[PDB]
Design an enzyme around this catalytic site. Structure first.
Site, short mmCIF file in Angstrom:
data_model
loop_
_atom_site.label_atom_id
_atom_site.label_comp_id
_atom_site.label_asym_id
_atom_site.label_seq_id
_atom_site.Cartn_x
_atom_site.Cartn_y
_atom_site.Cartn_z
N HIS B 40 0.82 -1.21 0.00
CA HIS B 40 0.00 0.00 0.00
C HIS B 40 0.86 1.27 0.00
CE1 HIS B 40 0.22 -0.05 4.52
NE2 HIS B 40 0.21 1.26 4.35
N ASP B 84 -0.05 -7.62 1.76
CA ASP B 84 0.45 -6.26 1.77
C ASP B 84 1.98 -6.24 1.84
OD1 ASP B 84 0.47 -3.45 1.85
OD2 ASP B 84 -0.25 -3.33 3.90
N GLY B 175 2.68 6.74 9.34
CA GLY B 175 4.06 7.11 9.05
C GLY B 175 4.99 5.93 9.29
N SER B 177 4.02 2.70 8.50
CA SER B 177 3.74 1.72 7.44
C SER B 177 4.96 1.26 6.65
CB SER B 177 2.77 2.31 6.43
OG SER B 177 1.49 1.81 6.73
N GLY B 178 5.02 -0.05 6.34
CA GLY B 178 6.15 -0.60 5.61
C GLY B 178 7.36 -0.93 6.48
#
Ligand SMILES: [Ca+2]
Lengths: 40, 223
Positions: B40, B84, B175, B177-178
């Site tokens: 995403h 994801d 912030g 994410s990932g």
């Protein structure tokens, strides 16, 4: 107010003149994305 | 990261930042030329930043490298956030040193109760908003399937794990994410989503990396 949303930071400006962390957090507050990016 | 602490410099050398104007997502360096992050966080133009501690100050250790290949999982579903995960191949290889190192992929899936380290530059507040200059760290356990599923009825696929506290108070946030979730030196999860941040009975949900070691290896071998 609080909803299931991805944790990405992709600021969006709201019809209420407020910028949300992302669109999911905007829609979650029944506010429309006036624009993509922090409200200037 | 909500309820965490400022990481020591050189403690998370595999942490990277993905930029498309500003820092939008985190990621992890898995080899000198490849980074893993959340699908995403996909953008058609991405600059990866490595060797960063304070994101607001050039410290002389940073490497700014553009992504050449940006590959999201074939089955990524944007509505449910299933699968994801995304792989990024750097245009030039990173230089490995004290502030830049790789994190290892997992041999098998983590057991519930495993303590893990989560990091990122996201929001440090669950109600207000405050983004730090320094990389934040948080120690949190892997939750059992029943607890995760009890927390998010009808929302957890077999490619998701909950890591955090049922009591709320400590969690990843916008912030982050990932970003990496590392347990016993192996990357077990990727920051993905949740119901707010640090809410009681709503632990963060992360991509289950152990389900993707083959896809990762095959993709790297073919590219
Ligand atoms: Ca810096």
């Amino acid at each position: 107010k609080v909803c299931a949303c991805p944790k990405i930071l992709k600021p969006v400006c709201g019809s209420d003149g407020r910028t949300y962390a992302n669109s999911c957090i905007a829609r979650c507050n029944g506010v429309s994305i006036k624009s993509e990016g922090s409200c200037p | 990261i909500v309820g965490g602490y400022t990481c020591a410099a050189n403690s998370i050398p595999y942490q990277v930042s993905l930029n498309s104007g500003s820092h939008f997502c985190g990621g992890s360096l898995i080899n000198s030329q490849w980074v893993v992050s959340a699908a995403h966080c996909y953008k058609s133009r991405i600059q990866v930043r490595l060797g960063e501690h304070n994101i607001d100050v050039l410290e002389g250790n940073e490497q700014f490298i553009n992504a050449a290949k940006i590959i999201t999982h074939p089955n990524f579903n944007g509505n449910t956030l299933d699968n994801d995960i995304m792989l990024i191949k750097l245009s030039s290889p990173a230089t490995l040193x004290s502030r830049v190192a790789t994190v290892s992929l997992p041999r098998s899936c983590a057991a519930a109760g495993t303590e893990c380290l989560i990091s990122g530059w996201g929001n440090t507040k669950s109600s207000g908003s405050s983004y730090p200059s320094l990389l934040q760290c948080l120690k949190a356990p892997v939750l059992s399937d029943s607890s995760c599923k009890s927390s998010y009825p009808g929302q957890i696929t077999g490619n998701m794990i909950c890591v955090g506290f049922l009591e709320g108070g400590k969690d990843s946030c916008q912030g982050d994410s990932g970003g990496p979730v590392v347990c016993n030196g192996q990357l077990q999860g990727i920051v993905s989503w949740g119901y707010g941040c640090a809410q009681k009975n709503k632990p963060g949900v992360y991509t289950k990396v152990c389900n993707y070691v083959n896809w990762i290896q095959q993709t790297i071998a073919a590219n």
